[PDB]
């Protein structure tokens, strides 16, 4: 069953985890697809996001450490979706 909701290969750890917690695991892997390896952000960033003007470093992987600055956040538009103006490793990026 688990090899069907996912993309194929499943580890035994996944199998025993589903049987202990059914909905928690189904929820976990869903968030895994959304946000990446969430456990890599520092606790203050994981809990509070980022303050305006702040730079923060995320050790995404061994030696891979991206330098993220939040420049400004916009007013919400119709449909209530704000635009977030990021500075990521020197370059500029917008997020909805």
């Amino acid at each position: 069953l688990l090899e069907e909701e996912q993309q194929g290969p499943v580890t035994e750890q996944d199998i025993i985890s589903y049987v202990l917690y059914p909905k928690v695991y189904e929820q976990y892997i869903q968030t895994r697809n959304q946000y990446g390896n969430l456990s890599l952000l520092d606790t203050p960033t994981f809990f509070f996001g980022m303050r305006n003007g702040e730079t923060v470093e995320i050790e995404i992987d061994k030696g891979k450490r991206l330098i993220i600055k939040l420049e400004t956040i916009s007013e919400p538009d119709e449909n209530g979706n704000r635009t977030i103006y990021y500075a990521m490793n020197g370059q500029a990026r917008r997020i909805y």
Partner: protein, 275 residues
């Protein structure tokens, strides 16, 4: 010396006693001690002078068994050439010898340090008597040095950026992109522009077209100066001395590229924030 022509020669050795030369490059277009334009090979040089200078490099470079990439520098006056210094490393303008000879200079370094013979299969350097030049390459370094303020480096935020390309244009990426803040602590180079063709005049026409197609706002820039140096008849002649900037007045003058697209944005911004 008097009214000469600065000319380098690119040699490459391996760790087995095999050294080849990818011919010369002209760097006589200099303002101060730093070089601003370098052409590969030299247009105004005779095939006899070019050979004696290249053989002079191979003589020195093999007598001491130099290994890996290097450069021997020569000044040239009339039929007489002399030696000044050696740069035992890559030069900023190796790209144009890469363009007209076909051999990847930086890559050949890496395999030489690994230990690959020059004429092995991984490098497959041509035999020396087969190395040649096809066409003429020109390299421009686009910097933030105010051509109208003693070439003092402008520091600030690039707010808009656009590179050119297409047939005959090779770019080497520096600190130039949209959003970069050029630090005052390093050489103020943004991007390495380098062209090529079958003539040195088609390369000039190609070079100015890309220098024009370039778009960098938010900071000053030496593009208009580099444009004048290109378009001047004293440069396209093929023969120019170290005394070329000094001899040419019309190079420094530059008409200021009116930043209509930005100035409009700047005005509306002021009256929106300040009323």
């Amino acid at each position: 010396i008097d009214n000469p022509k600065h000319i380098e020669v690119q040699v490459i050795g391996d760790e087995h006693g095999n050294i080849v030369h990818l011919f010369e490059r002209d760097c006589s277009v200099q303002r101060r001690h730093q070089k601003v334009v370098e052409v590969a090979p030299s247009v105004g040089l005779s095939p006899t002078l070019r050979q004696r200078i290249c053989d002079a490099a191979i003589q020195l470079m093999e007598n001491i068994k130099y290994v890996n990439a290097g450069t021997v520098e020569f000044l040239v006056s009339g039929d007489e050439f002399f030696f000044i210094e050696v740069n035992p490393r890559v030069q900023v303008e190796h790209t144009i010898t890469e363009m007209v000879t076909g051999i990847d200079i930086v890559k050949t370094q890496i395999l030489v340090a690994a230990g690959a013979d020059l004429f092995g299969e991984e490098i497959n350097m041509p035999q020396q008597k087969d190395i040649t030049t096809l066409g003429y390459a020109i390299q421009c370094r686009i910097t933030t040095e105010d051509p109208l303020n003693d070439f003092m480096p402008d520091t600030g935020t690039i707010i808009a950026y656009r590179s050119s390309g297409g047939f005959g244009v090779r770019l080497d990426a520096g600190d130039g992109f949209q959003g970069a803040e050029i630090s005052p602590y390093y050489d103020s180079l943004l991007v390495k522009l380098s062209t090529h063709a079958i003539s040195f005049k088609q390369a000039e026409e190609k070079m100015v077209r890309s220098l024009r197609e370039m778009r960098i706002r938010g900071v000053k820039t030496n593009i208009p100066f580099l444009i004048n140096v290109m378009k001047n008849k004293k440069f396209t002649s093929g023969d120019y001395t170290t005394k070329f900037i000094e001899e040419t007045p019309e190079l420094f003058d530059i008409q200021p590229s009116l930043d209509r697209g930005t100035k409009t944005l700047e005005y509306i911004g002021n009256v929106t924030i300040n009323g």
